[PDB]
Enzyme design. Sequence first.
Site, PDB file in Angstrom:
ATOM      1  N   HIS B  52       0.952  -1.082   0.000  1.00  0.00           N
ATOM      2  CA  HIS B  52       0.000   0.000   0.000  1.00  0.00           C
ATOM      3  C   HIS B  52       1.023   1.163   0.000  1.00  0.00           C
ATOM      4  CE1 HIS B  52      -2.574  -2.721   2.220  1.00  0.00           C
ATOM      5  NE2 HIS B  52      -3.571  -2.104   1.639  1.00  0.00           N
ATOM      6  N   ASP B  55       2.430   1.952   3.368  1.00  0.00           N
ATOM      7  CA  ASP B  55       3.248   0.931   4.001  1.00  0.00           C
ATOM      8  C   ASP B  55       4.745   1.297   3.793  1.00  0.00           C
ATOM      9  OD1 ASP B  55       1.022  -0.672   4.469  1.00  0.00           O
ATOM     10  OD2 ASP B  55       1.379  -1.927   2.721  1.00  0.00           O
TER      11      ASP B  55
END
EC number: 5.3.1.5
Lengths: 392, 392, 392, 392
Positions: B52, B55
């Site tokens: 993501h 992340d």
Amino acid sequence: VQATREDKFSFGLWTVGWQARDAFGDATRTALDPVEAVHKLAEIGAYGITFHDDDLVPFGSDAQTRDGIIAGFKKALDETGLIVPMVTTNLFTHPVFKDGGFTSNDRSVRRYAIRKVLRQMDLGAELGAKTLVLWGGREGAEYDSAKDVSAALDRYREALNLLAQYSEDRGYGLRFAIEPKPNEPRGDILLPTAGHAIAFVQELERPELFGINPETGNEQMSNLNFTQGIAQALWHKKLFHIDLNGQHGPKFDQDLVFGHGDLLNAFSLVDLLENGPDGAPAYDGPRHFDYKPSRTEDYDGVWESAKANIRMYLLLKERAKAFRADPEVQEALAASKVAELKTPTLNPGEGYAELLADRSAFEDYDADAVGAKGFGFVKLNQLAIEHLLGAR
Amino acid sequence: VQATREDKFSFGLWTVGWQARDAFGDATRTALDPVEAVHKLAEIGAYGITFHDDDLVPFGSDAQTRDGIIAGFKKALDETGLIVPMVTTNLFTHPVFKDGGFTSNDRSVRRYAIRKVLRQMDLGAELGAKTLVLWGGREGAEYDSAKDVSAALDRYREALNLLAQYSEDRGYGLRFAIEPKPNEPRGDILLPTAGHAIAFVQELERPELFGINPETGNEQMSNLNFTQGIAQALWHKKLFHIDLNGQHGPKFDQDLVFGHGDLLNAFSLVDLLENGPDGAPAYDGPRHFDYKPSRTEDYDGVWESAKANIRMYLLLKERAKAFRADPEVQEALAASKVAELKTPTLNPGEGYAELLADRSAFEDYDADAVGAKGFGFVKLNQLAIEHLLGAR
Amino acid sequence: VQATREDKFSFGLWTVGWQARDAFGDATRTALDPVEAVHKLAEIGAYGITFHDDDLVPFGSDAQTRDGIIAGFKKALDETGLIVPMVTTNLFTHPVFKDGGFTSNDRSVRRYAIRKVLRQMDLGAELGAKTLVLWGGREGAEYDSAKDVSAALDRYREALNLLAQYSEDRGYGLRFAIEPKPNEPRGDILLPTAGHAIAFVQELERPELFGINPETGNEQMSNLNFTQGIAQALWHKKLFHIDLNGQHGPKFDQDLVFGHGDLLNAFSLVDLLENGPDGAPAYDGPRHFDYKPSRTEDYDGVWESAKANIRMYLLLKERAKAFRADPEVQEALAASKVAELKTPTLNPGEGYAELLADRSAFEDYDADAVGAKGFGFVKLNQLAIEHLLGAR
Amino acid sequence: VQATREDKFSFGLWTVGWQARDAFGDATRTALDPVEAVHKLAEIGAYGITFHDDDLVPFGSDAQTRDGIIAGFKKALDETGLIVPMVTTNLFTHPVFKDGGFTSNDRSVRRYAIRKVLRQMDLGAELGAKTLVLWGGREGAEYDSAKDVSAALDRYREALNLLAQYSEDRGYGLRFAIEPKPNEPRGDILLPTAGHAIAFVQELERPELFGINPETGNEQMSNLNFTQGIAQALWHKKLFHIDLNGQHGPKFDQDLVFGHGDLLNAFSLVDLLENGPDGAPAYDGPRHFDYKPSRTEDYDGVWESAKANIRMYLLLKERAKAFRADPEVQEALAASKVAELKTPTLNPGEGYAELLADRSAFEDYDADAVGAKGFGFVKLNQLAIEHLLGAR
């Protein structure tokens, strides 16, 4: 309140006619005479009646008998003014269908299932039915290695393509509604949810002739939000028919009176079907009750339960309208920004190029300030419920 | 067995990097450095890593910071030979997304959500990703009146059409995979099952660029058969990616190692994916593990759990292969008639007219005799389990 | 309808104070100050407040700090006239509790878990609390081989026996209420239903001192009938406290306002607790709301949701009363034989010898005839729902 | 693997004898002759057979018929060496029991139900049965207002107390085992779980004569952990009998072969029952299969399925044994501290005062340092599955 023919309340012959033989016990009620059923339903306010071939004419009836039954049935309709909005075929009771009708591993069973449906299509066309409901209750498996799902979807498609062909050539003008169910009687049934059923229909030859017939309890058996699935079905324009009943989550199929299971979701569903755009209902087909009078009941409980379906829908309708008309609700809807979802995300004529150029949508966006503001959903929900309780 | 790059096992940065902060407690693990995660995964045999936006680059990193992280990341990829097959965007963590991303009732949130995604598509395209996964975790409601589903679906579609447009214009060549989830974190999530997402995808402007990214536990959260829904996704040709994990029926999202939930369904899933038509696999994308190392573990348990996912898949694959090469299993398959479903129901050139003409399909059909033949499904299921058990 | 101190509505500090940090997103609300909470709750009609140790005094506060907080808190209580009916201990947030408090595999954590509770007992004693609620949220497992259930029960018992010893020696007069939950945060929690908790309690050294604290939502996560389990708890006289909230079947713990999940069951529950034996309530303890204001709400939403809990209860109470006073309901109750169940099956002084001599209980019993009479349960259910909707 | 009488495998006559008439279709198999069932079971390795009164003697047979049937059945047991470890009564099939046996609202039905059971107790005693199983399938409701749970529990208790009185006076030496079920056929059944059944039994007059007969699928219908539940039953010493079968979570009662549903749970279960304290099984009674041969099968399929149950149990045992014996498992068990739960939390003679004086249990305790060590649970779990898979 009182039901009018404009409410379009219909019931299956197998509903009020359920003798109450369940998986663990014998029937607690004697058989219901179809002519009588027509009469009783006409009296409580139904505008139509539906049935499986085998509900009306006993499996393995000679031509003479069959003809005999139909003619008596037609008279009762005649006399009472009830119509047959939908017809369906039994492809689940006889032992030959233990592995399915259309997707039986056995080819001779698939051929027989098609024949059995063509025949009901003829009777349906002759009685004036507009919809053919298809419930593949035996389509599925108990064991994964026992059924090739891809091949089963091919055979399912192959049988539906043919039915559409036939109806179009005979000029019947039928619409076909696939009814999804996650399990019972098979461990796992094919096309388990309203979603899977719509995706499938889209792969048919004449998709415009196919839609779905979702049932309240079926989606709840998987703990899904019925109202939300029906809102998706309406978005797709595949809501060809609907089966109304009650259920208390994931457990065996209860078939309770509509609104006797998840009351809050029955309320939101009635609101969605009736408080459609342009004041008018978002759905104009039959409000069909596919339920079962509890096994603890006699024939009086049977008519009582039939009437309860109607009363539940009408009381909910009445509260959904008061809800929408409330000024305080109107104020809560505004604070919740329910209608702001209807305005496009992009300004007219804007594409990714213009969105990328908008610093306010990213570079200068204060996600933290926006994230601190509440939506007032709890208050909005509390107002809905107070309307449902008749407390406002 | 040992995993090869040809097995295409991939892991999300957020799986092995989950710090184990759950709904009732603090993290039990310190944060994992992305470069270290790249090296460790390469070492256990993964061929790719996914992430993501948030992340890799902490939400709100200045451009200098973000650029540095990206460059160190690419060097690690370079050095290990791992690739980035899919990328995704976090539209669920920040408070701003409390009512969703693309379908928030708040218009400005919808505009910001699309820009967050466009920015990730650029980074995905530069890392070579071929798939953009979309998990609308915050799209939905806790209360029925808070969300207009129809407007929500319109807004969802409006955002997705723009993304396809940008990609096609930029020549990114991305494919989009919507990931369905029934609930958690919203009481009810829009596009709840693989079926619902597939039916939605069919309404986009360029449906061919859209498919689904179904997750094992997600469908099990509704007690649906994952293998059977994957079979249907394959029939529609919409299986663009897959998330593999374990779950124990309807309860919070457990994210166990693949095969640690419903073992029998994991077995039949591996059989379906690898023993496809023509010897070859039915699916060729990544075998992605979207799981979480249990909160009870330390970094040793984290790598043990990453290795357990791959071991589970290879052991089941070995048993699935032996299963099909058994002459006893083959004989049971023939007795159960699995392959006979693959044969059209209608004869070549037969139409309804010819079917109606075949008295063997109805008039002379002995339903009763056919109805009494057993399918041998139990026996077949028993052989399948004996293979899984390594008893055969 | 307005709340009175007699209504005994209580709220946990952690309900209105929940910052809405979930399993997938950051907190959307700032911290709520305890003195503030006391003041706000006093205002909406709450008679009492409850808290976990760590909700009031931050984990690890030095004595000076801890002492300061308690003094402030006690003053707020004083001023508003609010009491502390129950207190509890947080044995789930801190990482040391990842495998449980009383049943952690680690002996040292178990020892620490007991010290943490003894400490909270003293504070509860000091504030006048009568009940100690024990929620073993981390007791259980994700994998069957990781936890020896037998040994875990021994250790759960060992710990409780000690707490009762201490309370009794010290003269605290506390009652202990075990709180059952099937799952979340652990894959499976020990003592999963009201039943499992009551059976366990029957095995402690001073059972008279132990009962349960069942939560609406926790039973519904397993699809169990909450009203029906409370009836059984009342039968055993083990309903020491109750946690009221809402849930939509088996999925993650939602913590909705009481009545926002299964409304029909919320109605039958209020009927049960209020339309008790005399005319009097069947339950005399606090009506405690253990819910969470939805993540989409700001502080206005929080206060709205607190009020909604009280409003739902009072509205349901009002309709439950009306239901029982309706002559039509009385008639339906008579037809359904509800009260006949309270008459012993046996006549006074009748044993098996007398029953065996009664030809009418078997030999001359016409089961067929009795089996044909209806119980009229649907009709009774329909009157109940109409009372709920304010339709009568 | 081969079954021995020491394995204690038993089958209900109603299992292999199930004609496959489900809620949606007619029977697909002919009736099985009791005598033949006895010979077939003896042949596949069973040590005993169980039956409901109405399974052996058709409801309403005269004494002449009744007597004749008992005589022949008795011969068959004679010739084969099979025993009758348990008997039960059918208090669910006949319409008279539509609202229950012992808890029917109708008083006459209650008297009748007791007589039916006393009679079955007589036959049981004559055939040497040691356990009377009571499955209250119809005790419960579809609507909350229809059943007074408190009154119901009083009547359930009244009936059971009479039964124990009689058996004790006639010197039959029977043990009574209550079988819990959450639903099906009633919307909700009284005593829904193993926990509720145990709590209830503790309230009878002679509790030592009462225990439970938990069924695999019954607990799984609520998504509970069957193994963990049995562990609790064993801790209470109330595991009097056990019904083994398979189920796929919350859906209708499937009754699959043991291990054909949640396979991982089937494994931990055999491990629990067999690897008891000091080598010896933790459980000594019959390993009874209460399942149904799938509706798609014929008598061939029936015998196959009977053998599959034994097969599954023996394959699992074998792997459970190997698991525990693996020094590598032994090592992982040590690292996870599974056996440390067996050590009392408190030192010998230590009470609250010594614990309060121990600084290491609180004041000087480093929760953060202990909170960071992993339990190694995923690794132990993966070792168990590899044993199950025959890969170790």
